[PDB]
Design a binder for this molecule. Structure first.
Ligand code: NA
Lengths: 217, 225
């Protein structure tokens, strides 16, 4: 094969050892070309991790090690840490394509990190948005693990699904996750209720925050 | 330190062309070749081509020969990628990377931060930015207030947000961008540390949208309605 293939996903618990396979073929690994590995942490550029099958650039932890054969290569990660989560790409050169080739990438997930309940902050419409005849409620949700929540909105005590837009969660710099939910209202709707609420469900608990049109009056 | 710094995000119509730059510093520019690599959403890394920074010789991938040109300006320690006949599949982050020799091959040892090229027919629009606050501008108890900025009505992605207290950058919480039903985007940035009292203008959120060559700063949270 003139293409490198990787499992889309690998996972392990803190402290465990995983390996990421990169299968190639006779025109790349089998033609004598080395493999290199790149690490791409969330929202960052790729970084060289292993070069020449098994060499580490300065600064890369020796928990990362590589091996290579003519049919595949293997990146081993010992002592998994939450900071290792990201995408890993292999790279080689292919004679039949006359060019550099990359694997499709493997997403590494570190499961079983310590649970962390979400921090929820609810924001009412700004005075400036209301002057533009618009009203958005913003529910910001931070510092939770595992990275899965569900969000529900209420007007007074009635569930509201119209006008709701919720992001899917994304990992923060401290290995916890963040998400947001927006409720788009008209100024009439905002003013016609006693309060609005954002309810965040995570691992067997729900936390609710409430805002009221005349709170800072 | 070896560093590659690329130009900012670009938006183009289908059929147009885009020129992205990559400025090198921290080493002798002409001693190392530069490669260009792209990453579309939902696709792997893809090699675009190579340029020798000394003599200007190029090699391109068969997928792009005929509509890509690489060039270099040694006086500016810069290489350029010009990609023409743009299509929707060309929406991608374009990286430059330095080629480094070792005993039995070459590797890509240093990468630029990437430049997002969006191919779109939709009009480009700078964000509206609203100061939002959890709690009251002047709290009635001694419990803290949280500042954030609501960033809405912009196209395409993405924005970059920084917070300042005076001249000093402050910790922030970043949140995903979401596409609204009206096809524009919105996002929020939160000042991480809760506040009790501050001088008007002491804190500000700075929102950059390079696709519209714009920067907006909000430094006033006025009294609530
Ligand atoms: Na190096």
């Amino acid at each position: 094969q003139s293409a490198l293939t990787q499992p889309p996903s690998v996972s392990g618990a803190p402290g465990q050892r995983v390996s990421i396979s990169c299968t190639g073929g006779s025109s790349n690994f089998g033609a004598g070309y080395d493999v290199h590995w790149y690490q791409q942490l969330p929202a960052t550029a790729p970084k060289l991790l292993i070069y020449g099958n098994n060499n580490r650039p300065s600064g890369v932890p020796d928990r990362f090690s590589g091996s290579k054969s003519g049919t595949s290569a293997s990146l081993a990660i010992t002592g998994l840490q939450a900071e290792d989560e990201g995408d890993y790409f292999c790279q080689s050169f292919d004679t039949s394509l006359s060019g550099w080739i990359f694997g499709g990438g493997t997403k590494l997930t570190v499961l079983g990190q310590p649970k962390a309940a979400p921090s929820v902050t609810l924001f009412p419409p700004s005075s400036e948005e209301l002057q533009a005849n618009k009203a958005t409620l913003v529910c910001l949700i931070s510092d939770f693990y595992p990275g899965a929540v569900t969000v529900a909105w209420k007007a007074d005590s009635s569930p509201v699904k119209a006008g709701v837009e919720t992001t899917t969660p994304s990992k923060q710099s401290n290995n916890k996750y963040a998400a947001s939910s927006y409720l788009s209202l008209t100024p009439e709707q905002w003013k016609s209720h006693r309060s609005y609420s954002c309810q965040v469900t995570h691992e067997g608990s729900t936390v609710e925050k409430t805002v009221a049109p005349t709170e800072c009056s | 330190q070896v560093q590659l710094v690329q130009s900012g995000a670009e938006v183009r119509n289908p059929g147009a062309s885009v020129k992205v730059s990559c400025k090198a510093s921290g080493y002798t520019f002409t001693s190392y070749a530069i490669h260009w690599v792209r990453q579309a959403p939902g696709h792997r890394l893809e090699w675009v081509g190579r340029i020798n920074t000394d003599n200007g010789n190029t090699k391109y991938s068969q997928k792009f020969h005929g509509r890509v040109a690489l060039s270099r300006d040694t006086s500016a320690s810069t290489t350029y990628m010009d990609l023409s006949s743009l299509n929707s599949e060309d929406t991608a982050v374009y990286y430059c990377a330095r080629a480094f020799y070792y005993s039995s091959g070459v590797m890509f040892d240093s990468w630029g931060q990437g430049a997002l090229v969006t191919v779109s027919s939709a009009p480009t629009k700078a964000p509206d930015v609203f100061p939002i606050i959890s709690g009251c501008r002047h709290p009635k108890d001694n419990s803290p207030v949280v500042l954030a900025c609501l960033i809405t009505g912009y196209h395409p992605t993405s924005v970059t947000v920084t917070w300042y207290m005076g001249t000093q950058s402050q910790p922030q919480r970043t949140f995903p961008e979401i596409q609204r039903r009206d096809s524009y985007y919105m996002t929020s940035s939160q000042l991480s540390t809760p506040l009790q009292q501050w001088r008007q203008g002491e804190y500000k959120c700075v929102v950059q949208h390079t696709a519209s060559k714009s920067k907006k700063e909000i430094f006033r949270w006025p009294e609530s309605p």
